[PDB]
Design an enzyme around this catalytic site. Structure first.
Site, PDB file in Angstrom:
ATOM      1  N   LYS A 123      -4.697  -3.735   4.393  1.00 20.77           N
ATOM      2  CA  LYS A 123      -3.494  -3.033   3.985  1.00 20.77           C
ATOM      3  C   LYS A 123      -2.944  -3.784   2.761  1.00 20.77           C
ATOM      4  O   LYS A 123      -2.329  -4.861   2.888  1.00 20.77           O
ATOM      5  CB  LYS A 123      -2.436  -3.008   5.126  1.00 20.77           C
ATOM      6  N   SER A 124      -3.185  -3.199   1.577  1.00 19.41           N
ATOM      7  CA  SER A 124      -2.640  -3.691   0.325  1.00 19.41           C
ATOM      8  C   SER A 124      -1.128  -3.575   0.241  1.00 19.41           C
ATOM      9  O   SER A 124      -0.506  -2.723   0.890  1.00 19.41           O
ATOM     10  CB  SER A 124      -3.286  -2.917  -0.806  1.00 19.41           C
ATOM     11  N   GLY A 125      -0.521  -4.403  -0.620  1.00 15.29           N
ATOM     12  CA  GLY A 125       0.932  -4.461  -0.747  1.00 15.29           C
ATOM     13  C   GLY A 125       1.523  -3.239  -1.436  1.00 15.29           C
ATOM     14  O   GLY A 125       2.650  -2.833  -1.124  1.00 15.29           O
TER      15      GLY A 125
ATOM     16  N   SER B  36       4.589  -3.191   1.127  1.00 16.06           N
ATOM     17  CA  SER B  36       4.181  -2.145   2.058  1.00 16.06           C
ATOM     18  C   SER B  36       3.173  -2.570   3.097  1.00 16.06           C
ATOM     19  O   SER B  36       2.641  -1.691   3.778  1.00 16.06           O
ATOM     20  CB  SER B  36       3.567  -0.895   1.335  1.00 16.06           C
TER      21      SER B  36
HETATM   22 CL   LIG Z   1       2.373  -6.109  -3.531  1.00 13.01          CL
END
Ligand SMILES: [Cl-]
Lengths: 240, 241
Positions: A184-186, A38
């Protein structure tokens, strides 16, 4: 350092860090392809913020039943309701809402218009599934850090990143106290923590270090290495 | 080295089968021993679908829903409520070891019962969905992919994926000579220490490959696997050809 971290964890690490104040780069498997999850949601939200002014974010979109896809925590409560573009970008950036991301891309002109914006930015690597640490960091700089967003559309987007809890155990834990991180984390659906990207702000420096960190174990869906990502961040931060 | 000694050196159990498909020469070490495998079987299932779908027909699309999604589906989790082609499910299964892409490829074949029937038909009566032997798995990859029925198109589509696979770097690809071309698929259990690699090694000057199967598990299952073991096994075994 980084190949010892490959050994230590048995993972692969892709890094690309760029100090935008000096032009300095830290690489490590920069031209290798990873599935980034994401973090693409940060791109798709900034390309719509290029075309819609901060005052026009109160435009409503109508959500209907067929619009909803899996892993939408906010937008599953909007069947047959209207929602502003602003609240679609908060839902996709704070919750990684899948319906919110689909409507934001619909609103840009479909994924071909996203692909084309990237060709214009000079990224012939990123595609919706995978990109390289290097391609992605450069796109993030050109589009958000040194792009064309208004003062207000870029504060809006960075504050959603600045005030996000998802990856306080990733790049955030890894930098020193006094660095500020907007990440922005996955937040991937089917496997544990693997990716994180951020704008790292030195105390006493308005320009960011852009930092992309993509990692791969293969096949172990419930083991996160939050600590492979914060160790990789620590070691990178020395260089600046 | 000896293989007996690498087991001694890394405190591991090694199973290996190699077949030079040009001469017919075999290397065996714990050949008939059963090992539980995982993702190395994605290349078997990719080859049974390419046996019934011409390359020009690989653009056919399947719809993905929430109920097809299983754990560790790096690529396909981005496709719920979407279509994806059949050339794309196979690349996600082979390059990224995606588990929703593997299950959807098996459903296209007609299910596990037709994967069984096909193995039986190729003469493999050992392999089951659980375990197999180095010798059975090696003769099966030879009869399906190296001396099989695939079109030229589909056999180079499949091997290009295995050849440009960046997750098999620390394994067979790392123990052979400099001008040996290696096309592999890796695998590793979730719950215990286990590390596998199957490959199609191309020695400089010959277009016939050696089929190499290496199955391994640490004798203490709580131990972290060591990629060096596969690399050094590969190096010894290749000295025999
Ligand atoms: Cl991730």
């Amino acid at each position: 350092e980084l190949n010892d971290l490959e050994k230590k964890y048995n993972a692969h690490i892709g890094v690309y860090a760029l100090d935008t104040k000096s032009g300095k780069e830290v690489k490590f498997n920069s031209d290798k392809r990873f599935a980034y999850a994401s973090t693409s949601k940060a791109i798709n939200s900034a390309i719509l913020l290029e075309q819609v002014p901060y005052n026009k974010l109160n435009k409503k979109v109508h959500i209907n039943k067929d619009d909803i896809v899996a892993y939408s925590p906010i937008l599953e409560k909007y069947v047959g309701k209207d929602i502003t573009l602003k609240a679609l970008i908060e839902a996709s950036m704070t919750y990684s809402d899948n319906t919110a991301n689909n409507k934001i891309i619909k609103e840009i002109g479909g994924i071909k218009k996203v692909k084309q914006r990237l060709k214009e930015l000079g990224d012939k690597v990123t595609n919706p599934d995978t990109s390289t640490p290097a391609a992605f960091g450069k796109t993030l700089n050109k589009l958000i850090a040194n792009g064309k967003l208004s003062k207000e559309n870029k504060k809006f987007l960075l504050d959603l990143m600045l005030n996000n809890k998802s990856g306080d155990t990733l790049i955030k834990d890894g930098v020193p106290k006094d660095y500020k991180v907007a990440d922005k984390s996955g937040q991937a659906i089917t496997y544990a923590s693997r990716n994180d990207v951020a704008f790292v702000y030195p105390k006493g420096q308005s320009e960011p270090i852009v930092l992309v960190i993509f990692t791969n174990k293969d096949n172990k869906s419930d083991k996160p290495n939050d600590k492979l990502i914060s160790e990789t961040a620590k070691s990178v931060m020395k260089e600046f």
